[PDB]
Amino acid sequence: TFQDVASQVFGQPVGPDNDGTLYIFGLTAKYTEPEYVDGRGPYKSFLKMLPSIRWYDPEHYWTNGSQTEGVFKNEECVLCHTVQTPTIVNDWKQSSHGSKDIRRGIGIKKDGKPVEDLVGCADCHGNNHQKLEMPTYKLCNDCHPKETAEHRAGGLGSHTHAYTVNVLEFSWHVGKPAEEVTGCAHCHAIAENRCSGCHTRHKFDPAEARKPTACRVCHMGIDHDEWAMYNTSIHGALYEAESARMDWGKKLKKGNYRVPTCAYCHMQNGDHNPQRFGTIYSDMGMFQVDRGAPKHKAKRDSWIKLCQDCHSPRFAADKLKEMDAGVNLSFTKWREAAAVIVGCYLDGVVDPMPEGSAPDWYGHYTFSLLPGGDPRFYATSNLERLGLEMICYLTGNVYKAYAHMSMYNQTYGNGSAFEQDRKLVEIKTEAAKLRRFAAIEKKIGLEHKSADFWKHGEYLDLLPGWKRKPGDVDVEWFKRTDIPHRANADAGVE
Amino acid sequence: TFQDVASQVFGQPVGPDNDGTLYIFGLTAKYTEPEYVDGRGPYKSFLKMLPSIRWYDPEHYWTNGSQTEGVFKNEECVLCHTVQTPTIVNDWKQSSHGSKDIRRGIGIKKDGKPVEDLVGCADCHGNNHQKLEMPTYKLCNDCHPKETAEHRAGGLGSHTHAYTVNVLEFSWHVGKPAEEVTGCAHCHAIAENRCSGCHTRHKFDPAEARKPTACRVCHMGIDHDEWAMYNTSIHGALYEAESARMDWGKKLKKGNYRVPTCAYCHMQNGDHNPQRFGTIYSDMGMFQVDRGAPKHKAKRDSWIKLCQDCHSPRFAADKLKEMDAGVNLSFTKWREAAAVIVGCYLDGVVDPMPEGSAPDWYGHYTFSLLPGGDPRFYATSNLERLGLEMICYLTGNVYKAYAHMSMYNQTYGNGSAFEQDRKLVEIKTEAAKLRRFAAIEKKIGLEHKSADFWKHGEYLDLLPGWKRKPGDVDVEWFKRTDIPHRANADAGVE
Amino acid sequence: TFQDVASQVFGQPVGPDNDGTLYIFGLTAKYTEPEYVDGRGPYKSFLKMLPSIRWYDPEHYWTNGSQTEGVFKNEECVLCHTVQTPTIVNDWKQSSHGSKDIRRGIGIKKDGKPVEDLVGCADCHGNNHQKLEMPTYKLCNDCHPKETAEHRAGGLGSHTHAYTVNVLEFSWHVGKPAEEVTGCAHCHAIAENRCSGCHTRHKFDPAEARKPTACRVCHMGIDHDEWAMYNTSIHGALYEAESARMDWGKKLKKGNYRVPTCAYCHMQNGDHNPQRFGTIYSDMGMFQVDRGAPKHKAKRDSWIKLCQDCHSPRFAADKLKEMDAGVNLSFTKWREAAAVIVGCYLDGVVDPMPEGSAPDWYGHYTFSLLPGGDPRFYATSNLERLGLEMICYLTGNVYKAYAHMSMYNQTYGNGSAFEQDRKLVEIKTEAAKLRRFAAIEKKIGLEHKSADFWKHGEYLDLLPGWKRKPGDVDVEWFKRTDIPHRANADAGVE
Ligand code: HEC
Ligand code: HEC
Ligand code: HEC
Ligand code: HEC
Ligand code: HEC
Ligand code: HEC
Ligand code: HEC
Ligand code: HEC
Ligand code: HEC
Ligand code: HEC
Ligand code: HEC
Ligand code: HEC
Ligand code: HEC
């Protein structure tokens, strides 16, 4: 093994990664599995989670783990936790739940009756310290049914199904070791199962939720993303300029704000179903659609009217037309790139071919840009990786750059037209190299066999694609009509 | 076509991109041209703009597009727009134009007479709602001649000619479909034609203009740029630390600020010609010049004295000498890279050679690093792309990192020495691959022909290089002496 | 030369880079050495510094350079500098040193006696303007012995030895021209030799030092780093949300803060030896260690208790276990990558082989991933560069992403699992190309010789590896036991 050789060269014994030894460049450590619990969803036969899933899907995983015993009153919760977890108490004392002086007389009710007392630690977590509860939106619904019903009103691609569908059914999550993608589970699960993603516990302050910081921890990246798209627009620059002195205590409403934030435009008038204002779900802009077409007029008009809070509607209309035009141009480059990549596959010059790689997460040796394949950036060919990057990392983000008025990210920036250009050159470069090698090998009669490292290795060998077998899919999950579903190749049903 | 094949594989009909259909990965959609208007400048015979250029070059493109009819008084503008575009009115009411209580008695005059009344919507836009005006600096000049004259005093590479010259004459803009580069036109045109780039409409607040946020929406990137260079210096960190509590109402003046901002150093004492403090124009640091040489002493001394607002002049002098030294070292790596790239061209081993690519925007098949060629990151070879990245994205930004005291971006960061190192390896890697292929093909007698995808494709076919013909340049534009010009290969004149 | 040819093509004379000429793309300029002074440390025989090192290692390099003569009283320092360097005086007047009204009666003493007077310019810099002093922590120790002793209590990898060891002994610094790495010397030297890195001169405000801005100018990057890791966690988002209105005047203490900052967690209770709270030094996470192993329990428990200021200890424990699991998974990908890269070397297919490159900074032609080699991103093969990037830029930062609770940077972001994936594909791609070339060349009988540009060039020729000779190491430095040392190949001792 690599570890055995490295052990003799660097003079450090081989051992398990988890024993506490400081391994020199990690060279002689052997991978050990962390403790797992079973994952939920249609791939439950092999999907794993780390036990810390208890906090994010508590209905299915939460158990008692406290060493403190007793049945306590609310005031006892506060007195002790003032010493034991002081900031939780400080947050709670600065919240409407724990302070009547900041209440606005909203008219909150539980079981038809007004909630006039403080809402304490015990009211949300329980009175028995050995049977403490870790809540979800189901608790909040007792007293905030409107916000909860909206939070639960989204379709696929919204907070509503972020975890239940888009973690448990998603290829990139199910195809990887659980501990590699813990952050995916939690980011998506906080969005779905909690009410603290925007207004954090334990202050639960709406003023905090109106700030772009309420969204950007999740809405960033693929490198750049809507955070960078917003922050590099003039709206984002004005947010930075005015944040410290503007009145964040004002409701999200026409005329209450000079500078628009994520919440202002997407949680219009406090609507807790922010997805619904979108024209149409486009798989993060990977699917091409002209939002200015006659069939989408009601949606376009609604956006124009939102912009009219602070602008001429003609100006707004022009800007959204620039989006449509910019998006349509961006897809010519993706189609150019796709032709080159698929062309290489049809000619059999891709190295490795699907047969030379580890099997995909379905357990098949299928080209990733075919229907039934798994588009990905890992455990695949360079050509396939670059293709996925073109469509996901770049083409989708061009739409986001136009949607958020980032002149820079539309053009020179990350996720831009010019990044698409450069990626197209990279793809053509790979393709050209592949074709020059194949042409030479053909002519001189060399029989090329793709290297073993495309197929086997310490990480590649951990992939679940190796252990897929017939009948390992819970197709009853996919038969459910109460949630939407991803169109996975092994779904087994409609 | 690609669309036809994809249509049969994915089961979605081919169609135009603009009909509103949600196209699966955009695979079966066909590119349609957006509505265009003719562009201005020396390439007016084929340059196009989207119609939204009306807002940014209104003198040449603005037309009535309102549905509201009438001739109104100022107070009528305000009453109705309070409902129709509330934030504009709120901004205006919080501006000196719309509120006497915040005026400073500057002594503003129009046609020799003092402006003592409110300056309302009608005073800037007109009284007739069917003949509304969209202004430029020409309006502001009526009452603010000093600021306007300075705004118009810059040379090439300043706000003064950002659009008129550096959009309308620039290869990367004229060589691309209009809708791909809308953001370029607007970013550059806002800088040139407007007075709202730093102090935004409709508050027009100088305190806002003093903040780095007044500059960073435009002065960012190539990936990193002067924003990142400033933000990652100790000055930038202190700006973030002190922004919320410092007094931004103070004039840009020696002793009024602890933390220097872009405006402080470049709009010294409120000068609206920020380019003039620069030692010399260097094409964004792509041209090498030692700013510490005896011939530039007056400029260096002026910078040292600016720094002396808050520092020892000896310290400042040392720091600017570090810039000079760091810059000069950076150019050894670019010259190393250029030798390798040009060497490959001279040996004819570049794939594709210029003849194998689409023609450049001049309509020629010329190597991009020759005089008369078009240095670019798109529609070119990987080797040429990497070269352009070395000089533009990296070498120029090394200067910016030193100029703005970013220890990190000088060394490990984006646009740094170490990024130059890595790019040099990438260039040598490409060169080495090209030479190994050519050596093999020579010896075995394979006649390599560069792939068709370097030349043709859905995006490449839209490029204006294909439709260039003799006599399509307005050389009278280039003959103008009232504006500077870019030294374009097809200029036809001096 | 390149310059001579370029001179004839572009029509600009060859000349020295430093004469002030504006060189077109820098093509015809010739590199000149800047003025140097000798560097300190074990490579003093050839290590150079720019003379500006005077400010950062003043004990060894500071000299008089003032034109102002006289012996002055404190009040005279202030009166004149109010005109000459106004912000220094403004800072000083707003500091406890210069204003009794903001003193807290800490009980500061010098030579056993209470310091009750103002501490003026002369008290820190001297009274004679021709013998002015540029201080280090040695000055501050006179009145602040506790903070200084802690600042000096760190081991290797802390502020305490940042410059003395990790600049003067480090391969990447000693192997490069001085002016390329000025920023390295200063960043590391400010951390070691000064007391102004966090609370800047001349205000020396602890409230400023508590902010993340006190750390991020140095603690950023390798592209992303702990700044990005912190800023993209929910803690970082809350810092941005609350910074403008929170009370930064509160001591770093349990219950004084809702949002934790770098200082809060690493300078626990004002401890000026922030390294000591770390479990173990791991060379920036390049060495693999399971911080959750039984042997590290005291450290893990201490972190859990720190988190318990604001959280359940069970939650904190789970989060740190996610770190351990995530880190261990990350090292499988590095070991996979290392096997591929070393495998290529063992098979002799790396282009260039070490013999085809310039010598490393030791003066040897050694493969960079061997013991005694120099792991690097510059002046090496693409395969070796990509390897260094995998372990340093990526694998180390995965640990940082988990340590700072950045769900995004653990997974999709910079320095993440998915970036590791992509880098692994890049490495395998390079390896596969190298093996396909070698297999062809073998079969057709082509004797490949690696290109000259891997070995010689304008930058490569400046490297100190060329001028290394026996007996050029000051091994007495490495024999010192009062400082730690790097395990350099040419150390000559234990
Ligand atoms: C009833 C028993 C409650 C439950 C369970 C939860 N909340 Fe609540 N909430 C409650 C009251 C009586 C109040 C004050 C209403 C008033 O008249 O002002 C609140 C208020 C909030 C708000 C607004 C906070 C503010 O504006 O400062 C938030 C955002 C909020 N509550 C959130 C919230 C969440 C996420 C809950 C589940 C975990 C939750 N509440 C439960 C009553 C009750
Ligand atoms: C971000 C996407 C949010 C999520 C997820 C949740 N809330 Fe929210 N909340 C959000 C903002 C931006 C605001 C202010 C909106 C406004 O109109 O300005 C709020 C407000 C609240 C309130 C106060 C309502 C009141 O009448 O003033 C409550 C009670 C509240 N939110 C409840 C709540 C619950 C129960 C949620 C999950 C189950 C929840 N919110 C999620 C931001 C977002
Ligand atoms: C108003 C000025 C906006 C602000 C400020 C923010 N966004 Fe936005 N977003 C805006 C529009 C007009 C669009 C296009 C919608 C269309 O149907 O035309 C978008 C789109 C997005 C999306 C995707 C929505 C989808 O495709 O349906 C997301 C996820 C998104 N926006 C998020 C986002 C965040 C987090 C913001 C702050 C950082 C933000 N937006 C600001 C308009 C506005
Ligand atoms: C929070 C820090 C995120 C992490 C970690 C990952 N995802 Fe994500 N995801 C996030 C956002 C805000 C978006 C919405 C973008 C929008 O414009 O819609 C997404 C979207 C997805 C999707 C949809 C993909 C598609 O079909 O278009 C999927 C299925 C998804 N995310 C899953 C997922 C998983 C499991 C990840 C790691 C394996 C991953 N995401 C990381 C936020 C975040
Ligand atoms: C005369 C008819 C005006 C025209 C046309 C424009 N402005 Fe003006 N401006 C005008 C007055 C009377 C004032 C107040 C002067 C006073 O005594 O304080 C101003 C002020 C400004 C300022 C400063 C704002 C402030 O400090 O709060 C700005 C930055 C400004 N004006 C900008 C500006 C621009 C960009 C214009 C063109 C679009 C413009 N003004 C036109 C009078 C008149
Ligand atoms: C950024 C590059 C700017 C552009 C473009 C314009 N202005 Fe400006 N303006 C700028 C700043 C940083 C400040 C404050 C400078 C200071 O001394 O502190 C200002 C100020 C104004 C003022 C007020 C002048 C007064 O006497 O107090 C006015 C009237 C104004 N600016 C006018 C103006 C006009 C007409 C411009 C374009 C035609 C314009 N500014 C552009 C920042 C920048
Ligand atoms: C003073 C401390 C500065 C601050 C703060 C900002 N910049 Fe700067 N800039 C500074 C100098 C000393 C230099 C070099 C000028 C030379 O002649 O020596 C620069 C250079 C630039 C440039 C290029 C100018 C040119 O080449 O002539 C630009 C475009 C620039 N600076 C922009 C910029 C911005 C937008 C800033 C804030 C984000 C900023 N600078 C801060 C000094 C100072
Ligand atoms: C605003 C978001 C920008 C976008 C979009 C683009 N450009 Fe730009 N440009 C911008 C800045 C602030 C700078 C000045 C940098 C400095 O140090 O001088 C520039 C510079 C240019 C130049 C000069 C190039 C040279 O010869 O050195 C050109 C000709 C130019 N910019 C044109 C241009 C076009 C048309 C773009 C898209 C096709 C592009 N820029 C994008 C700001 C921004
Ligand atoms: C001790 C408490 C000091 C007092 C009181 C003053 N200065 Fe200072 N200064 C001090 C140190 C530790 C340093 C070295 C840099 C660092 O950050 O550690 C300095 C440096 C200077 C400089 C040179 C650097 C610069 O920014 O230009 C000068 C010109 C200087 N200080 C001036 C000076 C004046 C005039 C003072 C009285 C108002 C003064 N200093 C007080 C620490 C101390
Ligand atoms: C004695 C002669 C001093 C020397 C030399 C330095 N400092 Fe000092 N410092 C001194 C006093 C009398 C005070 C005020 C104590 C009080 O009772 O409040 C201070 C205070 C500071 C602090 C705290 C500042 C504050 O809270 O606002 C800082 C951070 C500080 N001093 C830093 C510092 C540094 C870095 C020095 C070396 C360059 C230094 N001091 C020297 C007395 C003396
Ligand atoms: C960042 C890593 C720092 C360095 C390097 C130095 N100091 Fe510091 N200092 C730091 C912070 C975050 C704080 C506040 C800590 C708190 O408990 O909240 C301080 C505080 C000071 C004080 C005030 C102590 C008092 O009793 O209130 C002084 C006098 C001070 N620091 C001195 C000092 C000196 C002499 C240092 C270098 C020699 C130094 N500090 C370095 C941040 C950091
Ligand atoms: C508490 C919530 C933290 C905040 C806020 C910051 N960091 Fe941190 N850091 C934290 C821990 C629990 C760890 C792992 C330590 C271990 O032994 O378990 C880290 C680690 C780092 C490191 C490396 C330390 C080492 O390996 O021993 C550095 C250099 C670091 N942290 C820096 C850093 C900075 C600059 C921060 C703000 C931007 C920051 N940390 C915030 C916990 C906490
Ligand atoms: C400030 C802007 C930096 C620059 C410039 C460079 N380094 Fe650095 N370095 C910095 C930080 C905050 C860290 C600590 C990270 C942690 O988690 O420990 C480091 C670390 C190093 C090390 C340790 C490498 C190892 O053996 O693991 C070395 C030897 C080092 N830095 C040296 C160094 C040199 C000389 C650089 C340029 C040649 C370089 N660093 C740049 C901060 C910064």
PDB file of C-alpha atoms in Angstrom, chain B residues 324-388:
ATOM      1  CA  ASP B 324       8.575  49.785  -8.049  1.00  0.00           C
ATOM      2  CA  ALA B 325      10.759  46.783  -7.143  1.00  0.00           C
ATOM      3  CA  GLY B 326       7.826  44.352  -6.983  1.00  0.00           C
ATOM      4  CA  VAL B 327       6.490  45.497 -10.340  1.00  0.00           C
ATOM      5  CA  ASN B 328       9.871  45.182 -12.076  1.00  0.00           C
ATOM      6  CA  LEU B 329      10.288  41.622 -10.767  1.00  0.00           C
ATOM      7  CA  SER B 330       6.767  40.719 -11.964  1.00  0.00           C
ATOM      8  CA  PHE B 331       7.630  41.606 -15.573  1.00  0.00           C
ATOM      9  CA  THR B 332      10.459  39.028 -15.744  1.00  0.00           C
ATOM     10  CA  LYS B 333       7.800  36.317 -15.451  1.00  0.00           C
ATOM     11  CA  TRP B 334       5.646  37.862 -18.179  1.00  0.00           C
ATOM     12  CA  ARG B 335       8.635  38.175 -20.535  1.00  0.00           C
ATOM     13  CA  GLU B 336       9.518  34.543 -19.733  1.00  0.00           C
ATOM     14  CA  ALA B 337       5.944  33.543 -20.593  1.00  0.00           C
ATOM     15  CA  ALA B 338       5.818  35.661 -23.767  1.00  0.00           C
ATOM     16  CA  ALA B 339       9.069  34.079 -25.092  1.00  0.00           C
ATOM     17  CA  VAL B 340       7.574  30.595 -24.646  1.00  0.00           C
ATOM     18  CA  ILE B 341       4.275  31.507 -26.349  1.00  0.00           C
ATOM     19  CA  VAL B 342       5.799  33.431 -29.293  1.00  0.00           C
ATOM     20  CA  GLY B 343       8.473  30.718 -29.612  1.00  0.00           C
ATOM     21  CA  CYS B 344       5.688  28.177 -30.159  1.00  0.00           C
ATOM     22  CA  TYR B 345       4.161  30.384 -32.878  1.00  0.00           C
ATOM     23  CA  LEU B 346       7.506  30.890 -34.642  1.00  0.00           C
ATOM     24  CA  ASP B 347       7.935  27.085 -34.616  1.00  0.00           C
ATOM     25  CA  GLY B 348       4.347  26.603 -35.893  1.00  0.00           C
ATOM     26  CA  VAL B 349       3.382  24.135 -33.133  1.00  0.00           C
ATOM     27  CA  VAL B 350       0.457  26.124 -31.661  1.00  0.00           C
ATOM     28  CA  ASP B 351      -2.848  24.277 -31.949  1.00  0.00           C
ATOM     29  CA  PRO B 352      -4.815  25.775 -33.531  1.00  0.00           C
ATOM     30  CA  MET B 353      -2.657  28.135 -35.538  1.00  0.00           C
ATOM     31  CA  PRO B 354      -4.447  31.429 -36.321  1.00  0.00           C
ATOM     32  CA  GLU B 355      -5.636  29.944 -39.640  1.00  0.00           C
ATOM     33  CA  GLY B 356      -7.481  27.172 -37.731  1.00  0.00           C
ATOM     34  CA  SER B 357      -9.545  29.586 -35.605  1.00  0.00           C
ATOM     35  CA  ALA B 358     -12.418  31.886 -36.493  1.00  0.00           C
ATOM     36  CA  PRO B 359     -11.092  35.197 -37.779  1.00  0.00           C
ATOM     37  CA  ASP B 360     -10.382  37.854 -35.140  1.00  0.00           C
ATOM     38  CA  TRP B 361     -12.685  40.874 -34.860  1.00  0.00           C
ATOM     39  CA  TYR B 362     -10.638  42.705 -37.549  1.00  0.00           C
ATOM     40  CA  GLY B 363     -11.512  39.827 -39.905  1.00  0.00           C
ATOM     41  CA  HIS B 364      -7.935  38.502 -40.013  1.00  0.00           C
ATOM     42  CA  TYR B 365      -6.312  35.200 -39.067  1.00  0.00           C
ATOM     43  CA  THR B 366      -3.492  36.760 -37.044  1.00  0.00           C
ATOM     44  CA  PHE B 367      -1.645  35.471 -33.969  1.00  0.00           C
ATOM     45  CA  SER B 368      -2.963  37.455 -30.998  1.00  0.00           C
ATOM     46  CA  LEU B 369       0.449  38.418 -29.535  1.00  0.00           C
ATOM     47  CA  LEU B 370       1.664  40.060 -32.775  1.00  0.00           C
ATOM     48  CA  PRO B 371       1.233  43.780 -33.438  1.00  0.00           C
ATOM     49  CA  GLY B 372      -2.065  44.073 -35.319  1.00  0.00           C
ATOM     50  CA  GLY B 373      -3.408  40.970 -33.534  1.00  0.00           C
ATOM     51  CA  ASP B 374      -6.156  40.918 -30.898  1.00  0.00           C
ATOM     52  CA  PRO B 375      -4.970  39.785 -27.444  1.00  0.00           C
ATOM     53  CA  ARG B 376      -7.893  37.842 -25.979  1.00  0.00           C
ATOM     54  CA  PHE B 377      -9.203  35.094 -23.707  1.00  0.00           C
ATOM     55  CA  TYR B 378     -11.906  33.875 -26.127  1.00  0.00           C
ATOM     56  CA  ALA B 379     -12.081  32.330 -29.633  1.00  0.00           C
ATOM     57  CA  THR B 380      -8.341  31.609 -29.540  1.00  0.00           C
ATOM     58  CA  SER B 381      -5.842  28.892 -28.562  1.00  0.00           C
ATOM     59  CA  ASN B 382      -5.295  27.771 -24.967  1.00  0.00           C
ATOM     60  CA  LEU B 383      -1.721  29.016 -25.193  1.00  0.00           C
ATOM     61  CA  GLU B 384      -2.862  32.473 -26.337  1.00  0.00           C
ATOM     62  CA  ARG B 385      -5.616  32.602 -23.678  1.00  0.00           C
ATOM     63  CA  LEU B 386      -3.147  31.748 -20.903  1.00  0.00           C
ATOM     64  CA  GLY B 387      -0.834  34.476 -22.229  1.00  0.00           C
ATOM     65  CA  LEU B 388      -3.530  37.152 -22.103  1.00  0.00           C
TER      66      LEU B 388
END
